[PDB]
Design a protein around this ligand. Structure first.
Ligand SMILES: O=C(O)[C@@](O)(COP(=O)(O)O)[C@H](O)[C@H](O)COP(=O)(O)O
Ligand SMILES: [Mg+2]
Ligand SMILES: [Mg+2]
Lengths: 108, 445, 445, 188, 178, 94
């Protein structure tokens, strides 16, 4: 109905948009690698979404220049944990920050 | 006493010196060298008189001298004055003393018509004594767990009139729509219709009640400015007992002494501090009188505060070259010299953390494509009526802003021109958002 | 959003409302009614925008309305904007809140090219909630046993370089020479070459020793300005345990919050406060931009302090009519409305004691007879190089000024005209003192 | 030596009394202090270990096996969140102790108020996952005894079980002051 | 893990770097820069091992580098290893931290046989954060009103044995005598 | 049983400190209270050589939440007994 807005739970970022297409992931990771950051993968059950530290899968891909490898390890964590989020994080080594933090898969 | 000992064309400033730039306009016909020396004398020592006591001290070491003379480009009667000062003149870790020493008296001297301080070269020896930001940008993001996007903010309207319950009712609706900050206005310190002890406790329930329903960490600036530091620290402690994450303070109207007092209190207590630049247009607005806001930006970053207003974005303060001139000084660790952006000195901060650049002043939905292309992701956007001005209420409007910015950034990382394809990124996002579909229709275009 | 709702010519200002007077010049062509209403709006509410939350509040109670429009005499584009603000938008007993509500936002407004605040009518209800001066004029006179003559003072020179012992030695010379006050420079807070704990204890020895030798009570304004409010109180108590009677504090750069915090500290501890107005020329010097110093004088008399810099007497600030305007607000109990002296509103202070009007800026012996007639007896004179410029040292200079002052005063009560008969009053006092004879010769004429 | 030449419970006194001056004497070329027989009457006045081996084992519920520990690496560079990220992974793998390097007391790149806070969850999150109590020594070495007490108390309010201190360079006086503080607050 | 990354014969000292002087000799046969790099590595980072956690940090900024090698006069195996430290590695206003970071670990190494710390160059930024002397020579003389001559002191004897009042009796005689 | 007693000989021994006994006894009192379903307590001996050390043990006992304490009055002095007696009324112990 209009106009009544129901409170919606999004995780941190990119939540308000529908799930990203395969090509959206492609240019997003292209940007994150073009910035010189370090791709990093996380995953948790939806119950422990608020927890400060998630679970690595497997290690931060330091010094990776090929785009055909990370797009293959994003689905391995999903198939291994079909009830878990798949968060993709960018590690900023110089300033010890994180310039990109968006969840790829919401979790079946 | 005819000076020219304050005008030394051969001196090379030491790396521990504190340099300054005065855009000075002198009297008619006087030599340009004399007025710079007079400016140096009245801002450092104000001497020589005819006094016996003025020989007890070798004044050649303490006197601040002008070492370089330049003219402002495009104008004749004015000029640029560069002066060197020893580090011994200022108290360590004190910002109140340096302002009193530099601009405290030289303005009142009658031989100047228009004077303006532009930039300062802070030496590392003085920087390392100042407290600096309590948290910084990266630590703020790590503590609040928000990465890769500019934050959101809103200003509660109406400012005056809402009691404790209605204020909490209003802030609760804005928080549950996608926003993560709400700003207690500068007008609200303690009013007869709404005391702080009632506003503090009821905004605590609204923040915590909507926090769990959204799954994100939210905050609300509480105005803790007071007429006395004893009362102000009481509000700070009451905010701590409620567990709020971030507080607010007015530094120009509260004094650098109180601003530093709050800055050293938050670090020992682990809170984030917000700063409002009230009364700033009195000193900064005119181009030949007062002090540039860049000087105040450097002094604020040294004094403390994790978030400072930049403004005013209607449609922008302008010029963009000038705003980015002191925005880099608020975020970077080393800012090179540039006359186009007005960086007169090679400013190095070493390992001092930066401060967020806050943009506010009535942003509406079509300003997002241009707002992010200049401020970047290390910024906070604070609307006046952008959230509340939605016909469906103040809760649905927040989703209209959150959806608009997320499409904006997601278009920025994709290599698109956000500032150029504004309509193509705003309309296609409205296809998956009915609230944005009407929000884009309201504040057209 | 078309305004003209705030411009109500039929409203009658209440005896409890806060009034104001603005000198404005709007954009080319706009009516005076619209721009004055906009000025009132941006200083009170900044409304009505399109907000759904703005109907929960009875807005007509908290709105600031303009009830009178006057035209500036001698100008065509300018006019006076008289506005009345309700008493319920200000916290009781805070000076930092009223100025924040006033100049916090309206100065950044774009539709105004020139803006100046001139007069405010503080109602007695808000005056009664303010702390006010700690002792005042009469209490200081009773405590220090000085009646019937203006007090004297001196600024210690050189500003930079004196150690702990030499500072006291210079202080001891002037105090024993005839003066009864010495002023710490605004640069001195705590220098690397002179720590404040050494200056406090050494100047405590010079004051006490010269106190008994002459037989008078002497004071020395110690600069208690600090980077943090905690350090300010520590210095205040350390000065208290040393037995010093009076302290010095800088209000503009120390902030109204800290100044009021120290102001309420002095009344319980029996300390007198001296106020220095640093960098003030940024705001009050230009007649088209900024705030009149009268507003600051009223805010200080409301906040605290017993003595205040007025300056600048080189040879005078000029014109004398305006200076006598706010001086009447600094000392008197009732002030009528006078446009010639700029007394735009009938201001009543009730029963709050006044504040001494302190002149400064290099007064010498020949300026003294003309400084007595205009300022009266509730005034203090400070010389920086005038006292120390005497060829016979630093104690002989004070004797020359003290002899000249008393002759001028005694000639005033005799019905003579001191300002017109400066010569016949001054050379006749030189026959009874050789120090005054050389002081008159060295500074001619 | 007679017992009257030494102060009760003051280990610093015996040092300056015994080794303070003898080495500077000219008639000696090579000297080396090997052993000292401490009498029981002097032993009894000293505070001794705040917990000791038996109390530490009783409180930590770890018996029959030497305990394990790890030192966080790299020594320099890790931010507040990275320190907690690298502490959590080592604890969740089986170890029961993680060490703060002596270089980390309070660095500009990683403040101690953030190191203490971000370690507080890594220990608390890996403890519930394995079911074993885990600890992390927080370095409380400070330039002034007022700061070291502040860090120790802040560690106590976080519920951390154990702290770390450098006694050789930090001073026997400071170590003894902290040693008595640990006993009254139940700290290791 | 073979060093010479800490051996920077081209580095230029900054105005914030804290320099140090070491007189050292190592195991026989090692090249002179190798042992200097070894001394440099441990007192700063003691790295690189094979760790995934050692890539999370831009570790090329925090590294302490030895920039100058000079020969000790009169000895062949001895040398001067001048090493630079970025100011970021030490806490501001702390004298314990610099000693713990400097010699708290380097002296325990095996490849160094004789190591001697000779001098330290304190940068002004670190100097301004330290408390320093409370009064100083000038303030002490001003408070004690003793000008132009060295001060005279004595040690009370016997050191051990004197009672409460006999101590004051002995002290009074020395003070009243000059 | 509903109460267990600390005998008078136990104040503070080298083999058992007063801080260690208080904390481990506190776990047993609470762990047995939930199993039995009845309120149970254990007297803690707060006898010391100095009156302030009595108060420190008493406040440490309160922080652990034990309801009842013990004191030896003949060998502890009526002065100390009255000092603890009025302390209990404002803290509401037995
Ligand atoms: O310019 C002058 O005339 C003086 O230096 C005195 O000169 P003499 O020493 O020759 O008399 C004035 O005292 C200062 O300018 C201001 O005074 P103060 O600093 O005391 O406010
Ligand atoms: Mg506002
Ligand atoms: Mg002056």
């Amino acid at each position: 109905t209009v106009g009544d807005y129901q409170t919606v739970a999004t995780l941190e970022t990119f939540g308000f948009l529908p799930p990203m297409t395969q090509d959206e992931i492609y240019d997003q990771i292209a940007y994150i690698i073009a910035q010189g950051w370090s791709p990093l993968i996380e995953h948790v059950h939806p119950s422990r979404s608020m927890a400060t530290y998630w679970s690595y899968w497997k290690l931060p891909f330091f010094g990776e220049k090929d785009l055909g490898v990370i797009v293959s390890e994003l689905e391995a964590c999903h198939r291994a944990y079909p009830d878990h989020h798949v968060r993709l994080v960018g590690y900023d080594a110089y300033t010890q920050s994180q310039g990109a933090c968006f969840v790829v898969f919401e979790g079946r | 006493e005819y000076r020219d000992t304050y005008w030394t064309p051969d001196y090379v400033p030491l790396d521990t010196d504190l340099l300054a730039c005065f855009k000075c306009t002198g009297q008619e016909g006087v030599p340009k060298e004399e007025v710079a020396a007079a400016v140096a004398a009245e801002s450092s020592t104000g001497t020589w008189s005819t006094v016996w006591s003025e020989l007890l001290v070798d004044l050649d070491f303490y006197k601040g001298r002008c070492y370089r003379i330049e003219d402002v480009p495009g104008d004749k009667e004015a000029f640029y004055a560069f002066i060197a000062y020893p580090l011994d003149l200022f108290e360590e870790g004190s910002v109140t003393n340096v302002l009193t020493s530099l601009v405290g008296n030289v303005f009142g001297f009658k031989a100047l018509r228009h004077l303006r301080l532009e930039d300062i070269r802070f030496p590392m020896a003085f920087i390392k004594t100042c407290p600096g930001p309590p948290n910084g940008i990266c630590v703020e993001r790590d503590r609040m767990n928000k990465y890769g996007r500019p934050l959101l903010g809103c200003t509660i309207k109406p400012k005056l009139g809402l009691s404790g319950k209605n204020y909490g009712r209003v802030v609760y609706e804005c928080l549950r729509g996608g926003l993560d900050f709400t700003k207690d206005d500068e007008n609200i310190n303690s009013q007869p219709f709404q005391r702080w002890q009632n506003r503090f406790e009821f905004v605590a329930e609204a923040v915590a009640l909507a926090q769990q329903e959204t799954g994100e960490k939210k905050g609300h600036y509480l105005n803790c400015t007071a007429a006395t530091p004893e009362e102000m620290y009481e509000r700070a402690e009451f905010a701590k007992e409620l567990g709020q994450p971030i507080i607010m303070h007015d530094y120009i109207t509260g004094g650098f002494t109180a601003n530093t007092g709050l800055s050293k209190w938050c670090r020992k207590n682990g809170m984030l501090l917000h700063i409002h630049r009230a009364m700033h247009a009195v000193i900064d607005r005119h181009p030949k009188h007062g002090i540039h806001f860049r000087v105040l930006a450097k002094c604020l970053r040294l004094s403390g505060g994790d978030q400072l207003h930049t403004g005013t974005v209607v449609g922008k303060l302008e010029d963009r070259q000038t705003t980015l001139g002191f925005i880099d000084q608020l975020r970077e660790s080393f800012i090179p010299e540039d006359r186009s952006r007005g960086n007169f000195f090679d400013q190095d901060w070493g390992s001092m953390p930066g401060v967020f650049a806050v943009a506010s002043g009535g942003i509406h939905v079509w300003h997002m494509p241009a707002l992010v292309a200049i401020f970047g992701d290390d910024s906070v956007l604070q609307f006046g009526g952008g959230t509340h001005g939605h016909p469906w209420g103040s809760a649905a409007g927040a989703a209209a802003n959150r959806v608009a910015l997320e499409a904006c950034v997601k278009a920025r990382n994709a290599g698109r021109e956000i500032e150029k394809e504004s309509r193509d990124i705003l309309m296609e996002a409205a296809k998956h958002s009915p609230e944005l579909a009407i929000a884009l229709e309201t504040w057209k275009e």
